[PDB]
Amino acid sequence: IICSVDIGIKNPAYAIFNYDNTSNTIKLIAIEKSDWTKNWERSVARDLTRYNPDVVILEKQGFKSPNSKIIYFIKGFFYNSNTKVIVRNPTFKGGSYRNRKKQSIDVFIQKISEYTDYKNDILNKYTKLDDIANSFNLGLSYMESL
Amino acid sequence: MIICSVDIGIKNPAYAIFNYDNTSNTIKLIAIEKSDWTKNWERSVARDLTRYNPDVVILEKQGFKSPNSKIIYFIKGFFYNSNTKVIVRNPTFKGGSYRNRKKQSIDVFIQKISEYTDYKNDILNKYTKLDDIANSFNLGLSYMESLL
Amino acid sequence: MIICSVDIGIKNPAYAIFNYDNTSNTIKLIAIEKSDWTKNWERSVARDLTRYNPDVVILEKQGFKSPNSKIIYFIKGFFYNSNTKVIVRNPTFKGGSYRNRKKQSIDVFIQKISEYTDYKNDILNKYTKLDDIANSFNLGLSYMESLLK
Amino acid sequence: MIICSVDIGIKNPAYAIFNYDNTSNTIKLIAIEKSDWTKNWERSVARDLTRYNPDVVILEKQGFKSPNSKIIYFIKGFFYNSNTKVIVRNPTFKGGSYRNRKKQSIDVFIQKISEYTDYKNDILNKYTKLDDIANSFNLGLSYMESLL
DNA sequence: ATCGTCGGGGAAGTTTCTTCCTGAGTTGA
DNA sequence: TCAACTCAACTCGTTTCGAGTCCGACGAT
């Protein structure tokens, strides 16, 4: 069970998948944009223990945002536990910054439907800038490169 | 009631382990040591903090610009959902910048150690670089003073 | 009366040396000089002020939040021995903006020097900044004008 | 040589006049007084300093917060001519508490006052207050120890 | 003194300002 | 990590990493 997280005080988001390795049996369990402003450490632990994951995928950031403190908190929380937290270098923000639309809507409209069967169920009531894109793209890139 | 107060730092981290007798207000020094968190610092932090299975972990607050902050949240996440509360206390000595901070720390240490360990000479004779174990001891003792 | 009026300051101190006739009430400008007190100011003050051993030394009142006050009190102690009266006058040019003092000072200086030196041009060329020698000249001349009563 | 140590202040200035026998290290206290510099402080200062013709005058350095600095520079200009060495020493007891600054001062005072005058009758019966003449005497004695 | 505004290290000698020297961030390799 | 370079207050949640406060210097009356 794979859990990919877009970290940030802006709009944190997480996606929970189950991927059968090398078998191309992808199952999307959930995708959500949460809020980590009220009791953020308690809220982070509560959101991470919902569907106890085996791997957590994060985007590495510099000093740009306090979201790094969430990265180190997550590393400490799941350290001895069975899960393994891995922080991937930022693909995101390479050269230009006006390249979201293409990859976001393309990968969504192409690949969300075959895994959850609730494509438009989330589309009709979710709309945000750079949370579902970062989280889903990190998770899907890890799974495709897996 | 096992107290573990830590002076944080990647180069010279230090920790003091006290025993506070509940309802008796009895301070008994269990141990005081310093370690190194250079190679795979997460393993070293976890081991040094779980060494004596404490009930409270005391850390000293740093500003928003230091690697010591990264250790703070790792420890907070590590001991979260446990019967071991990590608390981040303000800097005990917050007066003089350099000449008063370290010297006042090691002075109050050398003066207040005698009533707690009964092994004063053996600890003073080893290190001679006291300004980390001194900070940890002062942090722990300040937390205990704030207990009553 | 050999009179020495001083515009005080570490960076560019200045002084004007006059001769005042006691029974004629006539002004005579002897000299006007800039100096430097940026290094060893007590030695420099003692040297520059005793250069033309005066009978009166006039200083301009300074506030307490300036090094000119310590120079004032050093001079007070120095000449408190004999033969030299140190007198501290209120700033002659007073009021309005601070820069209005400088321009008014150098203006009255430029327009009133000709009647005293006959070497007006040598002073305008050497030491082009005029806002210290003006202060010293105006201080001395104001004291001597206030001497009649 | 005749040594004159001054506790400066418009509040209650004080001075101690010692006589040091040259090459014998014999300290003899000539006088101790609490003067007043209220009206025409320059005249009063000059009178009090020229009362006993000294060879050195010892002052305690002050911060630029009080007219005592103007008195210091007045003294420097006054004795600058010749014959005198005005020395401005920092306040001797540069340590511990401020409330203990007077305690140790008057302690060293009461410790060493008896051995210097041999006419301590009028002086013992004279005054019930110390916290100015004590400071002046301690400054003077510190210079006397720093003399050899 | 008094209201508005600003900066926030220590020690010693060239002394009440200047000239240093600390010892911790912080920053690119 | 690490070695050169730059530069000095505290501090509380401000639902606990950054935006808030406090306390002595100047400037101009």
Author numbering:
A (entry chain D): 2 to 147
B (entry chain B), D (entry chain C): 1 to 148
C (entry chain A): 1 to 149
Task: Quote the passages of the study that discuss this structure, keeping the authors' original sentences.
The DNA resolvases orthologous to the A22 protein of vaccinia virus play an essential role in poxviral replication, by resolving HJ structures formed at the inverted repeat junctions in a concatemer of linear genomic DNAs. The poxvirus resolvases belong to the RNaseH/retroviral integrase superfamily of DNA-modifying enzymes that employ a conserved metal-dependent mechanism, including the prototypical bacterial RuvC HJ DNA resolvase. The fowlpox virus resolvase (Fpr) forms a stable dimer as other homologous resolvases14–17 and was found to bind to various structural motifs on the HJ DNA, revealing flexibility of the Fpr dimer in binding to a wide range of DNA structures. The 150-residue Fpr protein has the characteristic architecture of enzymes from the retrovirus integrase/RNase H superfamily, comprising a single layer of β-sheet sandwiched between α-helices.
